[PDB]
Amino acid sequence: ETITVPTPIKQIFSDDAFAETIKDNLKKKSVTDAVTQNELNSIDQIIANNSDIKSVQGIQYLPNVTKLFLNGNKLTDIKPLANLKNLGWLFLDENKVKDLSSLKDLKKLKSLSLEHNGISDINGLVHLPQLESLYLGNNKITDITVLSRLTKLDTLSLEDNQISDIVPLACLTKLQNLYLSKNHISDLRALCGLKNLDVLELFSQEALNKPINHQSNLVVPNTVKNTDGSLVTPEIISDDGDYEKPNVKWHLPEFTNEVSFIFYQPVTIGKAKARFHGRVTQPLKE
Amino acid sequence: ETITVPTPIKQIFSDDAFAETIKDNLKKKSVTDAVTQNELNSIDQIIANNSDIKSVQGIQYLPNVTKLFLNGNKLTDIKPLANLKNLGWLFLDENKVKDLSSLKDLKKLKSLSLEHNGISDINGLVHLPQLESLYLGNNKITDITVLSRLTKLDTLSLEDNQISDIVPLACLTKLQNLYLSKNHISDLRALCGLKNLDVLELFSQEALNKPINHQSNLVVPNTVKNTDGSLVTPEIISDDGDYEKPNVKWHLPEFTNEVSFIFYQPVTIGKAKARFHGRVTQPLKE
């Protein structure tokens, strides 16, 4: 519905914090002040960090907006963004946005940040093949299958998720910056071909094996593989265990519901030097 | 032991066919003719195809040899090659050479062919990091872990082996020509990053699942993955079965010890167009 007469900012922008934002963006005195379509048309960029915004309702009326800095807010619904056709940059860290269908037709969208949103299903990213930078740190992502389509990415952050299978990243040969700390990664082989990498982080993995039965002499295959497929030699083994390539071996006269080992290994891919470090946890039954 | 007087070709080269070869190489009249170290020193290249040679004993006395065309012979031991330090090209198709330790210090060796030798263990190839072309078609290779070190390869043939896991090839970003027909491959994802490929062959895979129990309504996960991780849609399904993404489903009122499906899908990697085609066989118990 068209704004055919000057209309109070608060009648368009139902959220009180977001009305304050539009107010300061346009250098108005008060949220009750009136705005025109013409003033709203002038807005290229909204800086709205850390404002406890719960809804961007009314943002549909800003059609020329190219940049949205919405980090540190309380948003759960980004449907109103759906028709911001010239949106290039969207930063939504620390909200709780899980429905990403709303981005599916933002064809100019080049940079997206959705850190700390509690997201598991990233399948909607598949509609954004033009993306150049994507930050998804600190979520609950396990399956990154769909990322294989995002071959324009030069920067990708997946730190602090639940990812064990990094095979999908092998398509992404343009990547220069890749952050994979605090995942569940134990097998680096499928990264070996990313020779444009400049920066890579791989610290503090938590690899979890499927449980096996407890026995008093337990032999467990080392599953930690460097980019060349060599087994990584554990540096510390729990419960007085021993390494005998290719197996970690424990004497457990008494039952314990887990054992584990820590590894640490420098790794080079392309021009990037990382520290592949972590722990493999082995749960036990019976 | 030094050749200090002209010595009959047959006293140096114990194998009758190989003595004939040295004889024609040097344009002598008879195998009983005498040769000097000086004539043997002049030999750069030996063409010995299809001669039923059973031993190259005496070849140690040809130190300047750079090229050995030994295809179509009956060799089982290539120890005498061990000190041919300037050997650049070695073609041993259709012999039965399984001990490759003898090549470990041939630092100039750039091209190697060992097709049709009945080889399973290719771990000795790891000492040949300089290799540029490697042909291993028609053997019994399952595990190509060590190939990840051969990053100078521009041409690699692994056709007609027993390979299911092609993850190791992801390191090999220089590859231009890659032949993988008639293996056991079902998952192409780890190839996606090989963007220098020019020629690629992937036809007639035979993927084999681990057996599962027979049931009269059998649901089996499609495991065939394109380079982007998408499931490949079966084109023909045995025993009147049906596809319901992501599962192949059969009604088997009566027991049968296997079912299967055929797939066929064009695939592009780098500048290379292949036809990923094959069959997945599913054996059944009880």
CB contact under 8 A, A172 and B193: yes
Q: Provide the chain A residues 140-169 that lie in CB contact (below 8 A) with chain B.
A: 145-146, 148-149, 167-168
Peptide bond into B246 cis (omega under 30): yes
Q: Is A268 on the interface with B (CB under 8 A)?
A: no
> Can you say whether residue B160 is alpha, beta or left, with left for phi > 0 and alpha for psi between -120 and 50 degrees?
left
Experimental method: X-ray
A91 contacts: CB under 8 Å, gap ≥ 6: A68, A69, A70, A71, A111, A112, A113
Q: How far apart are CA A99 and CA A26, in angstroms?
A: 30
Q: Cα A24 to the chain's mean position, in Å?
A: 31
Residue of chain A whose Cα is closest to the Cα of B187 = A167
CB contact under 8 A, A194 and B193: yes
| Residue A35 backbone dihedrals phi, psi, to 5 degrees | -120, 155
Q: Is A178 on the interface with B (CB under 8 A)?
A: no
B221, two tokens: 């996960």
A119, two tokens: 């997201």
Question: B211-286: which CATH architecture?
Answer: Sandwich (2.60)
Q: How far apart are CA B188 and CA B167, in angstroms?
A: 9
**Contact between A182 and A202 (Cβ < 8 Å):** no
Q: Is A192 on the interface with B (CB under 8 A)?
A: yes
**What does the H/E/C string look like for chain A?**
CCCCCCEEHHHHCCCHHHHHHHHHHCCCCCCCCEECHHHHCCCCEEECCCCCCCCCCCHHHCCCCCEEECCCCCCCCCHHHHHCCCCCEEECCCCCCCCCHHHCCCCCCCEEECCCCCCCCCHHHHHCCCCCEEECCCCCCCCCHHHHHCCCCCEEECCCCCCCCCHHHHHCCCCCEEECCCCCCCECHHHCCCCCCCEEECCCEEEECCCEECCCEEEEECCCECCCCCECCCCEECCCCEEECCEEEEECCCCCCEEEEEEEEEEEECCEEEEEEEEEEEEEEC
CB-CB neighbours of A206 under 10 Å: 16
Q: What is the resolution of this structure in A?
A: 2.2
* Angstroms from A147 CA to nearest CA on chain B: 9
* Angstroms from B6 CA to nearest CA on chain A: 51
* Angstroms from B238 CA to nearest CA on chain A: 29
Pairing of strands B7-8, A217-221: unpaired
Q: What is the largest CA-CA distance in chain A?
A: 83
Beta-carbon-side half-sphere exposure of residue A43 (alpha carbons within 13 Å)? 26
B69 contacts: CB under 8 Å, gap ≥ 6: B45, B46, B47, B48, B49, B89, B91
Nearest one of B156, B253, B138, B235 to B198, comparing CA atoms: B156
CB contact under 8 A, A148 and B193: no
3-state secondary structure of B275: strand
CB contact under 8 A, A191 and B170: yes
Residues on chain A touching B145 (C-beta within 8 angstroms): 229
> Per-domain residue ranges for chain B?
1-210, 211-286
Q: Is A207 on the interface with B (CB under 8 A)?
A: no
* Angstroms from A96 CA to nearest CA on chain B: 28
* Angstroms from A187 CA to nearest CA on chain B: 10
Q: How far apart are CA B224 and CA A51, in angstroms?
A: 48
Q: CATH class for domain B1-210?
A: alpha beta
CB contact under 8 A, A173 and B190: no
B198, two tokens: 């020019």
Q: How far apart are CA A120 and CA A122, in angstroms?
A: 6
